[PDB]
Write a protein that binds this ligand. Structure first.
Ligand SMILES: [K+]
Length: 166
């Protein structure tokens, strides 16, 4: 009933649950069936955005994510049996560096959190920007600013940090 409202805070899923409730306020459905349809369309459209980010941000060697422009950075290089991973953070609340290796399963999990950040890529330069992504030391894409882009970055760094603890 309310061990639920706990599992959701306890796993950083409060943001997702909140964007869902948010999506129901904007459309204001007449029934529970209308609401659930809207949540099924919401998730489907995001899977589409994510499917397109994966096509555009496809990488063979390396990626870099650089956010809050400068003050959070992750670089990943692929290898046959493991990926290598370098992080930096210089915020007011946390300063850190990390360098270490992750499994092929870990790379797959991280890659999905990365494509999720990829949904915030802009084609403009007219627009507030939150940073960029480099692919294979060739292409560079700018990221949009704002709380949903920041949340996606938070979730991506937090997972890499978790992998640092074995
Ligand atoms: K790169």
């Amino acid at each position: 009933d309310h061990a639920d409202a706990a599992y959701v805070e306890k796993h950083n899923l409060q943001c997702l649950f909140s964007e869902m409730a948010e999506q129901l306020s904007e459309k204001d459905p007449k029934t529970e069936q209308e609401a659930e349809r809207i949540l099924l369309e919401f998730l489907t459209h995001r899977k589409a955005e994510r499917d397109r980010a994966a096509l555009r941000l496809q990488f063979s060697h390396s990626f870099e994510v650089n956010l809050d422009n400068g003050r959070k950075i992750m670089r990943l290089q692929l290898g046959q049996e493991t990926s290598t991973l370098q992080l930096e953070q210089k915020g007011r609340v946390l300063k850190m560096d990390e360098a270490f290796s992750i499994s092929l399963e870990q790379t797959e999990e991280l890659t999905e959190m990365f494509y999720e950040l990829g949904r915030f890529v802009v084609d403009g330069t007219k627009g507030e920007q939150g940073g960029f992504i480099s692919i294979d030391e060739r292409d560079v894409y700018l990221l949009a600013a704002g709380r949903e882009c920041a949340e996606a970055g938070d979730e991506l760094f937090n997972l890499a940090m978790l992998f640092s603890m074995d």
